[PDB]
Design an enzyme around this catalytic site. Structure first.
Site, PDB file in Angstrom:
ATOM      1  N   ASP A  67       0.815  -1.243  -0.150  1.00 36.81           N
ATOM      2  CA  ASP A  67      -0.166  -0.005   0.209  1.00 36.81           C
ATOM      3  C   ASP A  67       1.132   1.185   0.453  1.00 36.81           C
ATOM      4  OD1 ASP A  67      -2.894   0.965   2.435  1.00 36.81           O
ATOM      5  OD2 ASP A  67      -1.821   2.198   0.704  1.00 36.81           O
ATOM      6  N   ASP A  88      -2.079   6.015  -5.197  1.00 37.40           N
ATOM      7  CA  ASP A  88      -2.357   4.896  -3.558  1.00 37.40           C
ATOM      8  C   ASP A  88      -2.845   3.473  -4.052  1.00 37.40           C
ATOM      9  OD1 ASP A  88      -2.648   4.031  -1.753  1.00 37.40           O
ATOM     10  OD2 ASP A  88      -4.999   5.429  -1.343  1.00 37.40           O
TER      11      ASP A  88
END
Length: 323
Positions: free
Chosen positions: A33, A213
């Site tokens: 992430d 992201d």
């Protein structure tokens, strides 16, 4: 100089992308992430019932405990996780970080409980936003960076096919043409960049900022942008069961593109069809609201169209269409 390739695999509908990570000899399936800077994992410290359907880390076997240290995260969706901290050896695609801080979970909310696809998260945002107290820790990347041939990582996420995470080198066979670089603003700890303009189907508008992201499934934009987009999709309607705007799966969706330092990054209409909404005859839109957070989230929907270089020198982000 170290370099390595880690393979990622999409879960159903490309909801998330997992990669194996070996911590102290145990392999766990983690979500990489770029929107967070914590490396937390399911552990033997959780209730036995919550450990079910996961690979868990056992800190006592190989970890060095950081006595008195804590970590804790609360998300806008209402999920949360917290626990304690150990240092261990963490290996990703043959690259090993010695003494990496590992955030062992002691408490996790229901949404993490219910997701048996992963065993934790590996944060690739800047270390400034790591949540460990009293002293924040460095991410896997910041820990190994100095030992890599180049202090960068690159990602190619794909639609229902394995992709890669390249650590310390650029694989030019993964994109077409040349990379276009844009400067990053890491002041809030994110891989934040600016777009000059956007085109949603037949309508164009002013630019804005957003973050790259890998941890967010969708493309989250300002509600004005979302409306403009779905005003061009016949029958598009919001469905709280599904999670936002849905449409007939046979719909012909417009492309979405953003202009970045001269380069047009285009998301084809076919990638904006996320998949079945799991309720009747409809499909979920890959473009959804950012809920008035003030910045856009360039999630997996967007990244599946590009090869992206996360370069700590600048810092800067390079983009090119996936090959």
């Amino acid at each position: 100089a170290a370099s390595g390739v880690a393979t990622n695999t999409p879960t159903a509908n490309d909801e998330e992308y997992i990669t194996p990570v070996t911590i102290g000899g145990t392999t766990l399936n983690l979500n990489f992430d770029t929107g967070s800077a914590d490396l937390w994992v399911f552990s033997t410290e959780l209730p036995a019932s919550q450990q079910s359907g996961h690979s868990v880390y056992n800190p006592s076997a190989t970890g060095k405990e950081l006595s008195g240290y804590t970590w804790s995260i609360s998300y806008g969706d209402g999920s949360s996780a917290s626990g304690n901290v150990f240092t261990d050896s963490v290996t990703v695609g043959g690259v090993t970080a010695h003494g990496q801080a590992v955030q062992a979970a002691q408490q996790i909310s229901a949404q993490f409980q219910q997701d048996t696809n992963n065993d934790g998260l590996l944060g690739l945002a800047f270390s400034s936003i790591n949540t460990v107290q009293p002293q924040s820790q460095t991410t896997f990347f910041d820990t190994v960076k100095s030992s890599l041939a180049q202090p960068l990582f690159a990602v190619a996420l794909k639609h229902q096919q394995p992709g890669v995470y390249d650590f310390g080198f650029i694989d030019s066979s993964k994109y077409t043409g040349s990379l276009t670089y844009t400067g990053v603003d890491n002041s809030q700890g994110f891989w934040s960049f600016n777009v000059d303009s956007y085109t949603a189907g037949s309508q164009s508008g002013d630019g804005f900022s957003g973050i790259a992201d890998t941890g967010t499934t969708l493309l989250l934009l300002d509600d004005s942008v979302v409306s403009q987009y779905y005003s061009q999709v016949s029958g598009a309607q919001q469905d709280s069961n599904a999670g936002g705007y849905v449409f007939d799966c046979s719909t012909n969706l417009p492309d979405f593109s953003v202009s970045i330092s001269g380069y047009t990054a285009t998301v084809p209409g076919s990638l904006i069809n996320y998949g079945p909404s799991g309720d009747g005859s409809t499909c979920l839109g890959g473009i959804q609201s950012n809920s008035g957070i003030g910045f856009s989230i360039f999630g997996d929907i967007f990244l599946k169209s590009q090869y992206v270089v996360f370069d700590s020198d600048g810092p800067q982000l390079g983009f090119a269409p996936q090959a």
